[PDB]
Amino acid sequence: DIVLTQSHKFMSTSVGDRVSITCKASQDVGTAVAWYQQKPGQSPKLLIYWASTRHTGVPDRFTGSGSGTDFTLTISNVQSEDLADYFCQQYSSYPLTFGAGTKLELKQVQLQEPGGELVRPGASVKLSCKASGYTFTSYWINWVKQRPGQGLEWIGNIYPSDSYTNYNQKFKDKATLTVDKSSSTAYMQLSSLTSEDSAVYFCARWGYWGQGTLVTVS
Ligand SMILES: CC1(C)S[C@@H]2[C@H](NC(=O)[C@H](N)c3ccccc3)C(=O)N2[C@H]1C(=O)O
The span from the first CA to the last CA of the chain, in angstroms, equals: 31
Q: What is the resolution of this structure in A?
A: 2.4
* Dihedral (Cα; 97, 57, 78, 63), 10-degree rounding: 60
CATH number of 109-207: 2.60.40.10
Residues of the chain within CATH 2.60.40.10 domain(s) are 1-108, 109-207
| Residue nearest to ligand 1 atom 9, measured at CA | 206
Instruction: Return d(Cα 106, Cα 54) in angstroms, integer.
Output: 25
Q: Say how many CA atoms lie within 13 Å of 131 toward its Cβ.
A: 25
29, 201, 206: residue to mutate for ligand 1 pocket, most atoms within 8 A of CB: 206
Across-strand partners of 164? 159
Ligand 1 in contact with 157 (CB < 6 A)? yes
Backbone dihedral angles phi then psi of residue 80, each to the nearest 5 degrees: -55, -50
45 contact partners, CB below 8 Å, separation of at least 6: 36, 37, 38, 209
Q: If we measure between CA atoms, which residue out of 89, 81, 97 comes closest to residue 44? A: 89
Instruction: Return d(Cα 47, Cα 36) in angstroms, integer.
Output: 5
- Which CATH superfamily includes the segment(s) 1-108? Immunoglobulins (2.60.40.10)
Tell me how long the chain is.
218
CA angle 7, 12, 17 (to 5 degrees): 100
CA angle 196, 202, 203 (to 5 degrees): 130
91, 136, 137: residue to mutate for ligand 1 pocket, most atoms within 8 A of CB: 91
